[PDB]
Every structure is written in C-alpha cells, then in structure tokens.
Amino acid sequence: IQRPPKIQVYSRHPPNYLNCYVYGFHPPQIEIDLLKIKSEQSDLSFSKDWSFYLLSHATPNSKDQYSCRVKHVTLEQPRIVKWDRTHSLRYFRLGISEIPEFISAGYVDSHPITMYNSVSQLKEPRALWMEENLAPDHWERYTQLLRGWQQMFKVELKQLQHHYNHSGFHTYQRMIGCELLEDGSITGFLQYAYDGQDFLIFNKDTLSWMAMDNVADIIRRVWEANQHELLYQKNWLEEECIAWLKRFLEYGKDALQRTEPPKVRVNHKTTLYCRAYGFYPPEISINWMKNGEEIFQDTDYGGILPSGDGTYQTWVSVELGDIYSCHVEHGGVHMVLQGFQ
C-alpha cells in the first residue's frame, strides 16, 4: 500500500533551528527541501506501522518567509508547507530493489542507536553512550553478520516478487524486538512487511507463523517445518533480547532517565493554539479546557514532534464570558495556562 506523507514545519524553540518533520509515508522515496537553503537531513527512520519519518533542519525568523517543499509518489503536487512507559528494543530491516538497497537501524525507546547501510557497509553508533561503552571489536562482528543478513534479505525479496508476480521497485521490511513493562513483565514481537503491509507475524506462545495472504502462506509452511528455528526465535525474544535491552539502559541511564519540562506558549489567529517546547521524556498530555472541562469538538492534536535536541514538542488547537485554558501534564505535574476569556 501507499501512504501519503504528513509534514509539519516548526522551530526548535519559540536564532533558531528550522525543523521540517515528514512522517507516516511510504514508499520511503522522498525529497525534502527547505526554502532554497541548505538543510541537513537526518537518517531514514522506521516506525512500528511500517511507515517512515524524517527530520530536516537548518532561522531567526524576522521580516522573512520560510517554507518546506516535499516530493512524494502519492502527491501530484510537490507540497510545500509554509511555516505560519514500557522500555523497549526494536530492530528494523529495510530491503530495496533500487536510497540504499539495505538499511538496518536499532531503536531503544524510539531512540536511534545502531545504523547499517548497504552502500558503505559498517555498523556505527547513533548514540554517544554506544560508542563509549561498546568495544570497537563489537561493531566488528555486526558489520559481518549484517552483510549476511543483507544478502539474505535480497534473496527473500527476489523470491517474493517472483512469488507475487511483479518486478521493479518493491520494499521488504522486518521488525524484531522485545519490550519490558513497568511492572516487570515482558513480551516480544517479530514481523515482516511487503510494500508497507503486514506480511508475516510470529507468535511465540504457539510457536507458529501467521500468514495474512495466500502467498505469505507458502513461506509459512516453509518456516514452520523448521521447528527448531522457531524454538531458537523464542529464546532470543524471551531471553537474549531482554538482556540486550537491560544492557543498553545501564549504558544510556543518563539520557533516558533525564526529565525536562515543557515551556507552554499560547496563541490565536477563531482558532487557539497551544505549543509545548523542549520536553522529555516524550510522554505528555495536552488538551484545551473550557470552564473547566476538556474540549472535544473542533480540536486538533499535532502528535509528538522531535525538537532536535533529543527533546520534543507538541500542540493542541481549538476553534472558538467563558475561559479557555491549556492543560499540560509532563511529570504529572498538571500544568494549566489560561489563554483567553
């Protein structure tokens, strides 16, 4: 399936950094340009729904106009926006029939850590605590394993089209990982995707594979007769993975356990805006309130957006002797700001 991109332009604080954040799109092929000025773009990132997201940054914003141009396969028009608690571990594989053909990136709590691409094949730390704690001879086995997993992924991608019927551009995505709930319980997940749709889903309790398509069923029967593999998959997810997760935490206990609160700002243009800048961890709740209850009709949430400092920012808007106030909860720690009356 094809997913049209969602883009939002904003600033790192209220001299600034101009952020262009494009998310929830597929195929991953896209072009992001700031207007035109040089804009450093981040690495391609993956989400749990098989979509993608990207943050391009470069803006005192005084007596001038800024915008962001985006080109994608679901767009006839190259759209330009004018400015105006469970810890977890995830690993993503991106195959391509063509930017690179193969991409591998790790994520702990939605934080980039490991990166491997098929152009220059190496495993580099995306986090400072990774490079510091992990011996250089570590990354060395994994450029080696990854080169194999790359080739193995290419073979499975060829086999899939041929199995499916098409040629040309197609995507193959794998997701594996485990997560640790606050109470101490754990779970694990393994899934494959073809062209951005769920392909195969592994159940570790039943030691079986779930096929969502007649064609995905062929591969099912192939892996299920492998019953020792599955047995191996179970142990990794259930045991080996969790260990890996807990190891990185001890490493990244500094960054992951820090907390900075939001500085809330309110504005109006009819419509009332509430922006929360530079907060962490990502978990937060914003809603408008009217005397004094929460508002529902004509409300718009902007989800959570990366600030670029590793911090984040979100917003909530509402279309209009009543008092309108903005309720934010970070540490929880309820915060309220009266905007208007």
């Epitope: 086995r141 394993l145 080169r147 080739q151 193995m152 593999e229 179970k234 142990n235 080996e240």
Partner: antibody, heavy 108, light 115 residues
C-alpha cells in the same frame, strides 16, 4: 568464554552412557552436539534451545539454560558409536564456541 | 552434494607457500575454515559470512583466505610454520546464524610442517 566436557569415557556395548557438558558464556543461542568419528569430519547430532529433552533415534540430548548444563544420552550402545562427541554453544554474538570433544570408547 | 576439501594430506618444509581448496555443492552462503588440534576444540581461523566479505577468526595469525566463487573457499598460508601442523577443516552453513544452522564439515586436511 568457557565450555567443558569429559575427555574420555568407557562403556561396554549395549549399555547406556551420558556425556555431560557445562558451559559459561556471555549469551546463549542454541547448543550443539556433533559426532566425530575417529579420523573423520564431525557430523551434526542434535541442537537444543529451550529447556527440555530432545530425543532423536537412540540418541537423546537435554538442556538446562539456568544451570548452563547439557548432557548427551546414548541408549543401546553399538560399536559404531565410539567417537569424539563435540559440544559447542553459540555466543551472545553468533560465533560458535567449541568444547574439546568427549572420546567414547565402546567395549565389545 | 557434500563439501569437497583438498588436499587430504600435506607435507611442507618451513617457509613453503601452499593453498587448501574447499568446495561446497549445497548452495550455502556461509563458509568456514577450522584448525583442530589434540586436547583442544575446533578453532576458527577465518570466515566468509557471505560472498565478498570475510573476517578474521579466533586465530587469524599465519593464515589468509579468499572467496573465489560463492561455492569455493580457499585457505592459504604463504609461509609454513611448525606450529601450523594440524588437521584443517572446512565447513559450510546455509547462513551465518540463523542460530539453528548446523555446520557441514569437509573430509579434513592433514598437514605436517617440518624443518
């Protein structure tokens, strides 16, 4: 880091023998048992991951992940069973760590 | 099919350069070389995870390797040493783990280096 197992064991034909294998590594994916006849190339016997017992033919293997202990249990020994049994276990990374085999000498 | 390994025996004077050839008929991506000595388990000299990449093993010293085909993995030593006397094994796996994958060993190569 380390994997251990007896150097030589002697048993008469027809009896039942057990080869203990104890290992301590950084991580655990699977445990391997290979048979290597004298003057030959090892062959694959059995592979264990989840705690429990694995029986194939008159050969059987068991695995304890907590205790880091696994044994090889051979019922009804024939003369052909005399060989060096190699115990190997995969590291945290996928490299394989081999223990020096247990040479089984079958008494006719 | 099987794994073909040559030669099965060798005798070299120290300082000699000789290569060992290994062939895999099983359509395997992963290829290995082992050195087996009495009193100690198999020690991996070098490996080809897949065609075109090869990484040093536990004991890379004194050995150098190459992937010619996808099917062929040849072990080389350009200088023979007395401490290099051993029984050298080649093996192939379908992929680097993939943790259940068993190794398939070759017949073996008996090497003896003398002054």
């Amino acid at each position: 880091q380390n994997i251990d197992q007896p150097t030589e064991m002697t048993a008469t034909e027809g009896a039942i023998v057990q080869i203990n294998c104890t290992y301590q590594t950084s991580g655990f994916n699977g445990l391997f048992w290979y048979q290597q006849h004298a003057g030959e190339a090892p062959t694959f016997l059995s592979y264990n991951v989840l705690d429990g017992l694995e029986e194939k033919g008159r050969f059987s293997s068991f695995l304890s992940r907590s205790k880091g202990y696994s044994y090889l249990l051979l019922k009804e020994l024939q003369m052909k069973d005399s060989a060096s049994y190699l115990c190997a276990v995969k590291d945290s990374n996928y490299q394989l760590i081999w223990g020096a085999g247990t040479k089984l000498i079958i008494k006719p | 099919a099987g794994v073909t390994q040559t030669p099965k025996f060798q005798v070299l004077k120290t300082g000699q350069s000789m290569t060992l050839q290994c062939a895999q008929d099983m359509n395997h991506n992963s290829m290995y070389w082992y050195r087996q000595d009495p009193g100690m388990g198999l020690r991996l000299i070098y490996y080809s995870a897949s065609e075109g990449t090869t990484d040093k093993g536990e004991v890379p010293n004194g050995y150098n390797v190459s992937r010619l085909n996808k099917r062929e993995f040849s072990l080389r030593l350009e200088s023979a040493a007395p401490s290099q006397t051993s029984v050298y094994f080649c093996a192939s796996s379908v992929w680097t783990g993939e943790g259940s994958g068993e190794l398939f060993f070759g017949e073996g190569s008996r090497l003896t280096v003398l002054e």
